Design a protein around this ligand. Sequence first.
Ligand SMILES: O=C([O-])C(=O)[O-]
Ligand SMILES: O=C([O-])C(=O)[O-]
Ligand SMILES: [Mg+2]
Lengths: 329, 342, 347, 328, 345, 343
Amino acid sequence: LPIHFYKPLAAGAPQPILPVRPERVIHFFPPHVEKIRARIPEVAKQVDVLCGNLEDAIPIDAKEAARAGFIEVARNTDFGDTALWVRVNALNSPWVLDDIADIVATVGNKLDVMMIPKVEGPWDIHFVDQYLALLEAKHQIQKPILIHALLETAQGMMNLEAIAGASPRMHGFSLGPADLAASRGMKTTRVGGGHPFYGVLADPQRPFYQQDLWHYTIARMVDVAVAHGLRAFYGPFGDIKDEAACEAQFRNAFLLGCTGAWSLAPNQIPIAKRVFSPDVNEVLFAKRILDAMPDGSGVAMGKMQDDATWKQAKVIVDLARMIAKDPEL
Amino acid sequence: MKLPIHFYKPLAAGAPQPIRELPVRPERVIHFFPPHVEKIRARIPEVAKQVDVLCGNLEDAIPIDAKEAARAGFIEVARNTDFGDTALWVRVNALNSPWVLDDIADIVATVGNKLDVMMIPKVEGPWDIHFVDQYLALLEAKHQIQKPILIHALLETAQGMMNLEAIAGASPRMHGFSLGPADLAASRGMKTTRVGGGHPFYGVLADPQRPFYQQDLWHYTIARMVDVAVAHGLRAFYGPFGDIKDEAACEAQFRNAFLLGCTGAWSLAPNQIPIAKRVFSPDVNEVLFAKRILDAMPDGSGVAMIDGKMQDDATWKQAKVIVDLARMIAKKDPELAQAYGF
Amino acid sequence: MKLPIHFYKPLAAGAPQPIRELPVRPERVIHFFPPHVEKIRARIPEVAKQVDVLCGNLEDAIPIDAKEAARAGFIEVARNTDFGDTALWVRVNALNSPWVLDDIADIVATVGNKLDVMMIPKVEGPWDIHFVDQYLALLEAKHQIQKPILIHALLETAQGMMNLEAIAGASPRMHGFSLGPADLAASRGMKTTRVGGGHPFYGVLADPQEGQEHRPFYQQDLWHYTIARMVDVAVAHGLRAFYGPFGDIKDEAACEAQFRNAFLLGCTGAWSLAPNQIPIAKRVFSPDVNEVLFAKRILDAMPDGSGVAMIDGKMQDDATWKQAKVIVDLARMIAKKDPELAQAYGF
Amino acid sequence: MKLPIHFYKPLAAGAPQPIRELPVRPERVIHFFPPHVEKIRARIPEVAKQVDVLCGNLEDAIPIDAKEAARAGFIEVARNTDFGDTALWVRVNALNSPWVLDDIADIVATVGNKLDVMMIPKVEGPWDIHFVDQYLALLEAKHQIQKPILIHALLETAQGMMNLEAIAGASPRMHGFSLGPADLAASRGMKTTRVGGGHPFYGVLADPQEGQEHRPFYQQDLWHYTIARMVDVAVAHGLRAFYGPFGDIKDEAACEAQFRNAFLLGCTGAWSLAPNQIPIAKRVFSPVLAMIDGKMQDDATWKQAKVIVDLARMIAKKDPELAQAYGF
Amino acid sequence: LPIHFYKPLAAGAPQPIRELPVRPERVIHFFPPHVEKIRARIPEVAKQVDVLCGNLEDAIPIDAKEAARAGFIEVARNTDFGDTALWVRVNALNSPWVLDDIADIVATVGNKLDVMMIPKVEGPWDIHFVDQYLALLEAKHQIQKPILIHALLETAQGMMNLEAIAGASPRMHGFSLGPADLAASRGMKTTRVGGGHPFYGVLADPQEGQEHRPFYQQDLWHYTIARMVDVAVAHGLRAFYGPFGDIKDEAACEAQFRNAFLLGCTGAWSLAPNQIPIAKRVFSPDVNEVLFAKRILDAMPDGSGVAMIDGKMQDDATWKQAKVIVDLARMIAKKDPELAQAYGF
Amino acid sequence: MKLPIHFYKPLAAGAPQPIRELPVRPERVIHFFPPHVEKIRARIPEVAKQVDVLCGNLEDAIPIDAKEAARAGFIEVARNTDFGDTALWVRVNALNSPWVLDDIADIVATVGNKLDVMMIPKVEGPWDIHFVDQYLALLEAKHQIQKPILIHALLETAQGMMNLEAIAGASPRMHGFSLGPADLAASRGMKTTRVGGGHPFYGVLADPQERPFYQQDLWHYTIARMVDVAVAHGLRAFYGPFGDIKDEAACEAQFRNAFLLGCTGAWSLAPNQIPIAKRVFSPDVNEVLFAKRILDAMPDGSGVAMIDGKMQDDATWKQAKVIVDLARMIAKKDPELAQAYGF
Ligand SMILES: O=C([O-])C(=O)[O-]
Ligand SMILES: O=C([O-])C(=O)[O-]
Ligand SMILES: [Mg+2]
C-alpha cells in the first residue's frame, strides 16, 4: 500500500525517495585490475555513470579481489558529478551476501545505485530492499541506495510490472541481452545485437527486409519503467569494433525512450554520450515548436503542432539543456 | 473489477440501460474540427455528409482563451444540424482541467440525445472511466437522455498502456481506444517531435557484405491496443497523422494500422477524409466470406463448415456485423456497392 | 492460481501423477494428417520415422460427415502402429463442438496409453484448460492410463493472447502453445495474404529524398509482437512455443523464412502440412551447434551438477546445468536419427 | 475471471442461454432421499407435495455397490413423478470419483429437462466449476436441454472456503452454496459432537467474581465465521447460502436452534435428512420482509421487494395458514 | 501507482494529506439540517460532541432535500465549530440530489467541511468518482484543505470489496457500519436497527435433571466488526459503529457501543441527545485500565523486557497495548477536566 | 505469486532442496525460554524431555541490553544439547531491528543443522517471508545446511491479518502461524491489556426476562480466519501465549477453544502450562480410531473404499496416515495415551 510503501524497512534507515542527472553512458570497470583502478579518477570525469563489476567476466578466484578493489577506489576517489554504481553478484551466488554487506559498510554513502543480476520477480527486490535497509541502519547511511534490475530471463520480463512496483528504491532496468537471449532461446550473432536472417521475404514479383529482434522487449521495458517513474536502459553492445552497429543499436533504444546504454570499452563512451544526447537538428525543430506556441495552448501550421507536440518538444529541449554544463546550443 | 450481474446496471435512477453489444455503424474516419471558429462551423452540415464520424474537439489544439467558445460552438452546431447517419462525438478536456465539469455538463444538458460517443483524453487508469461513467449516469438521469453516451479512451500515456486491460473492462459504456502518438511519445519519452509516422533513425544496420532498414516505431503499441480492445468487444483506432501535406506517408500509416486490425483513423483536414475511408473500408474477401456464413446458417443455429472451418453462433454473429457494416457503407459509396455486392 | 502444494496432485483417484517437467524429445516438426483418408493411413508407419511428432487432425478441413471416420481412423492407425521415437499427438474438435466429448473419450478409452499430447483448438482462457484437465483425469483413471496426456493450446483469438499467462499456468498438463494464424488473424482485424505469412503492404515509407522519385518502402513483420509475447509466457512457465502452419505449400522459401523468424525468437518447432515442409522444419528448428557445444562445456565443468563454476565469464549453477543437460540430451536424440548432426554436435 | 461480454454466452453450440437472474421459488427445505431404496421411491410423489425442493443423493451414505442402483433409481423417480412446484435437485459424486462422469452424463441424457440444480461435492475452487459448467453445456447441447441446469457448490474444505469468492463468480450457472459441516470440520480439524452441530466445550470462562467459586461458562457458536462469510459472498454475487445437514435427527430442538441461526444470518434454507426435519425447515426459513419509513427507494430495492413478494405468494399457494397470515 | 497516489487529481486542489488529523472521534452526532429548531441549537450542541455530521440522506423526506441541503450550508457558514469536526452525509451516488449536494456544499463551505460521508458504497469505483469530483470542485473554489471521504458499509458487495474501497483514495478517512441497510442487503433478521437477535444463540446439550436447556445468545455483528477493524486499521483508517436505533434502550446501546470499542472501533453515531454522553463514556478508556496501563509505562521506561507489576507480568507487547490506551486517555483529558483528574494528569 | 515450476527450487546454489510436505511430529506445546538466563539455560536438557517443541526467544520479553547475551545463550545451550525427539525453534528479532541480521546468520552458522523452525515476529506481508527465505538459503548454502530451516509466521499485525493468504503462499519454507494476541490487540487498537483470554465486558445483553449478559469470544474471527488460510496451504495454526499464568482454568479453556477450531498446539510461558497444552492438543481418540480404520480398509492406500458412508481415497488415506503417525510418536513417550490409541 502507499502508506507503508514509503516507510523505512529498518529503524535508522534513511527516508525513502528519482534524482535528476544525465545517465547517457554507464561505464563498466573491473575493480581487480590495478591499471583500470589507478585511472578511475581521470576516467570518472569522462562519463555520466561509473559502474563497478563484481559479476560477469570476474573470475571466481578474483571475487574477493574485485570486491576489495571496488571498495578501495570508491572510498578514496571524489567522483564529483559522476554517479557511482556497482553490479554485485547474483542472489543465488556464494558472493552476494559479502558483496552487499562489505560495500554498504565501507562506502554506503558514496553508492548511488546497486545493479542486481537476473531479477526474476518482486521477491528478489523484497530481499535486496530489506537487506540494504538493515545494513544502512547498522552503518548509519544517510542516503538510501537505489536498486537497478538487470533483465536476463523470460520470467523477469513476464514479471516486469511487479518488479517495477516492488520497492520505492527502484531506479530502473537494464536489458541483459546475452542471458535474456539464452533464456528465451533467442538467437543473435552479437551480444546486444540482432540477426541478419531475421526478416521478411518479399513476394516473388527477391528482396529481404531485416527486422529488429529487440522491438517488443524494448517497447515493453520502456512502458513499464516509465509508468512507474523509472528509467529503462539498453544494456551492453558486445562487438566493440563494429562502431557503426553500436551507434545504430544505441540510437534505436534512445528513440524508443531509453535513457542510456552500457559502455564496455573506452571507444563506446563517446558513442553513448553522443547518441543519448538529443540531435541538434531535432533541438532546433523542437525550439521552433516551443517558440510557435508560448504555452501549451494553441495550434501551429506544414505539420500540425499543438499542446502535445509542445510536450514532445519540452522533453527534447529539457534534456539538451541538462546535459550542457559540451554542445552549448 | 465489477461482477457481471452488476456490470450492466445503470449507475443512476432514470439513466438509460447500459448496452450489451456495440452499435454497428461506419467509423472508418473521425473528422476533428475546432468548434470555436465560425468558418468551419458553417460548413459542418456539408462535411457531415462526407464523413462516417464527426468529432468536435475541446482539448489540445484549442487555446486556453477559446475553450468556453469551443464549448458553446459545439452546442450551437449540434443543436442546428441533423447529422443523418454521421455519428456525433466530442473530445472534452482532461479530467484534471477547469473546463471538464462544464464541458460534460452543458453538452449532456443541451445535446446529450444527439451525442453518440464522448472521447476522454489522457486516461491513466480505470478510476478515470469510473468517474466519467458515474458523472454521465447522473447527467443522463437529470436530462432524461434516451440512450447511453459511450466512452472512448485516448491512449496517450505510459500508465494508460500499462493499465489498458483495466480501462477496457471498467465500464459497459466503453466503445474503444484511439492512439494519441504525439502525447504517448511525450509520455514515454520517445525522442521524436513528429506525430506518428516512420522515423529515419529507427532501423536495422545490416552486416558488412551498409544498408539501413527502417522499422516501425508503433508495432508493439498498436498490436497491444488491438488485442486488448478486441478481447473486450471494443474497437481500436489509429489517431492523428500530423504531416497533413504528406498524403503518401499518411496512407502507409493508416494502412499499417488497418492491417494490424484498427477500425478507422482521425482526419485533421479535408485531404485525409478520403484516405481514411479508402484504407479502412472492409476487405471484400472478409465481406463475401461473411455472406457465406449467413446463407449457410438460416437462423444462426446449429453448426456448419465452410472451407474446412466449423461455424457457430459466435462466427455467425461476427458475420452479421461485418455484412451489416458493409451495407451501411455501400449506401453512400457506389464502388463498394458492387464490390461487396449490393 | 492453484496453490503449488495442490498443483501437482492428480484430479482423479487412479489418474497418473502429473509431471513436474516436460519430457525432452525432438519436436522440430508437427506433421498433420487426415486419419479418415485410407491412403494416408496406410503410409503412416513409414511417415512415422521421418518426423519428430505425428499429429492426427479431427478439426479443421475434416468435413462434418468425415468427423466420425477421422475419429475411428486415428484410433485404428494408433492401435496398429508402433511409433518408436515419434511422438503421437491429436488435434481434437473445439470445446463448443458436437464432437469433442466423443473425440476425447473414445481416443483415451482405446489408445490413451499411446497419446502423448492433445491439442485443443481456440483456447480462450484458464477455464478451457480446467475442463480438459479434469475430463482427461477422469478418463485416465477409468482406462488406467500410465502417464499424463499433456494439453497443447492453440492461440486463435484475441482473448487467448490476452489470457496467455493464465492459460500457461492453468495446469501441470500444459505442454505449450501453437499459433493458429488464420484464426488469430480473423479474430483480430488482421489482414494476411497467406495463412502462415504477413502482408506486403505493411511497411514503413521513407522521408522524401530530394534526389530520387521512388521513396523506399520497407516491409515489416506482422507477427513480431504475437511471437515475442508467446515465447516469453511459454518459457517463463517451462513450456514451449510453436509456430503453426504455413499455407503456401508451394512457396518453400517463404516457408523457410517464416519458420526461421520463429526459431530465431525461440519457438521449438513448426507444423508441416505437406511432405516438402517436413525437411524444412527439421533443418530450421535443429538446436544451434554453438549452444550445444557450449552446453557440453557446462556439463564437463560440473560433473555431478552441483557447486558453481564459471565458463566464458558467466556463472553456472544448478539451473544452467539442468538447462544444458536438456539441450545436450535433445541434440543426442536428434543425432541418433541424423548422422550429419551427430558430427556437428560432436557425439 | 471471464469478462461480462463473454460471461453470459453458452459454452456449447446448441446449449441453452445462460440465466442473467436466479429463479425465485421456495427453497426453505432441501429434502434428501436415497434413490436406490424402493420403499422411498414409492413415497416420492406424496413427499414431493410436502417439500419445496427434493434432492436425490448419489454421494455420502450411498454404498459403493449401490451407486449404479442410486443413479438408476433417481432417474426412475425423475421421469415418473410430476413434481408440480417442487424443484428437483441431485447430488452427484465427487469430481475425483469413478462415478461422477456417468452420474452427470446418464442423468442429463435421461431426465435432464426435469433437473433444476445439480449439487457438486467438495468444490475446491473455480476450476471445479469450470469443468462442470463446460461439461453440462456439451451434454445440454447434445440432448437439447431447454433451460440450464444450475450448479450448487458444497463447501467441504478449507481451500473451498478460501476460494469462495472465485467459486461464486465462476459461472452464471452458479446457484449458491451449502455447508458440509462434517467434512468441513474434518478438513479444518474442528471438533464437533454432532454433524452440523457444534461443541459444548467451545466457550468463554468468566473471571472469578466476589466469593462465588463457580465461574460461569458461556458456550460459543463454532460456525458464526463460516456462515457470515458464506452469506456475504453468496449475496454479493446474487446467489443463495444454505445451511447443510443436521445429522442429529432425534434432537428436534437443537435442529431448530441451528436452522434458525442460519436464517437470522441470511441463509435461504436447510437440508432435511428425515421427515421430522421437513416441518422444522419450512417453519424456521419462512418469513414482505419513492421514500417510505425514511429510506429512499429505487430500481435495486424494487426488484428485491418483488422477489420477497413472489416468494410469499408461492409459499402461500400451498401453505394456507401462511397465506392467511401474510394477507393473501 | 504509489507515486501517482499522493498527486493532486486536479490543478488548484491541495496536496492529498499524508496522514489523518489527530483529534478525538468518540461520538458522531447526527442532525437534520432542514429543521429550524435544530439549526438554532447547533452552536450549543457542537461544544458537547467530537464530531457533528449533517444528514441529507435517510430520514430526510424527498420534499425536504433542498431545505436540508440549504440548511446545512447555513449552519456551517454561520457557526464556529471550534475543536469539533464537521461532517455531512450527502445523498447516494445513484440519486437525483447528489451532484448538487456535493457541488453546492463545497462551493459554499468547502473550507469548513472536514469529512464527507458517502452512503451505500459498493466498490472502489464509487470512491474514484467522489475523489475526482471533489478534486475538481476543490480546485474551482480554491479549497485550502482536502475533504476526506467516509464510506458507509450498507451492502454485501461493499463488505466483499472492503479492501478495495479502503485503498481507493488518500482522501479515505474510515468506515461506518450501516446495520439496518446491511441487514436488509444480507437478509439478516435483527430485532432492532443495528442490533442482535434474541433467538441467535446456542442451545446446550440435554441434561439429566434440570431438563431446561440453557440458551447462550451470540453476537450477530462479530464477523462484520472484526473484518471492518482489520481492513480499516491495516490501511491507517478508523472504523466506526453506525447508529443504534433503539433510542430508549440505553443499556443495550451502551453494551453494543462497548463491544465495538473493545474490538477496535474509534467511536459510534449519536442520533438523540441521550446517546451523546453514552458514546463519549463508552469510547473513552476506563479509569482503572488507564491506571493499570499507566504504571506499565513506568515499570519499563525503554518499553523493552519483562517486568512484574502488582501480580501480573508485562512485556514489550503489553507496553504497546498500554501506550495506546494512555495516548488516547491523555488526548481526551485535554478537553475533559473530570477524566483528566481521574486518569491522573 | 511464484509459479509451481519455480516454487520448490532452492534460492541459493548449495542450499538444501525445499520440502513439498511438512514434517510430521508432535507440536502440541511450544515452550518458550529466555536464553540469556543461566539458571534456565542449565535446566534446558531436562525440560527438553518434558516438551514437544522448545523455542528460544530473542524478541519481546528480552531487554534491549540482554539481546546479544540472549543470542549467545541460545547458541551455547543448542550447541551442547541432544534434543532427541524435541523440535528446536527460535523467535528471532523483528526484520526492522538492529539484532536480526546477526540473530539469523550466527544461529545458522553455529547451530543451523539443529534448528528445525525459525519464528518471525510482526510479519506484515509476503515481502518479509521473501527476505527471510532468500537470506536463510544463502546462509544455508554457505554453512552446508542439510535440511531446510522452516519459517513460522507470528500473526501479530492488522496488515498480517489482511495479507494472510499472500504470507501463507509466499514460500515452501512456511510451517504455519501463531496468534500473537498482545501485539495484535495493540496493532488493531483493541482496548484490552489482557493477553488472549475472555474480556468481561465483551458480551451480548439479553432482553428483559419475565438482565443476563453472555460473554463473547474476542478471537472467533481471528482463529477461524487463521485456521482456514493455514490448512488450505497445508500449514498448521497455533494459539500463542496465554499471559495469566495463575489462572489455569482459563488457560485450559482458551487452549481448548483453539483446539476445537483446529489449532495444532499452543505456547507455554511457564511449566504449569506444559501439561495443559499437552492434554488439550493431544489427538482425540475417535480421530485416531477412525484414522486406523481408513488405513485397514485400504492396505495399499490405493483405489477407492468407503467408511461410515464417506468415500475414502488417496487424499483421505494421506491424512489418516498423518494422524496415526502423530499418535504413534506421542505414545512413544506417554504410556497412558498408548493404551487409549491402541499401541
Ligand atoms: O492526442 C493527440 O492528438 C496526439 O497526441 O496525437
Ligand atoms: O508478541 C507476542 O508474542 C504477542 O503479541 O503475544
Ligand atoms: Mg493529444
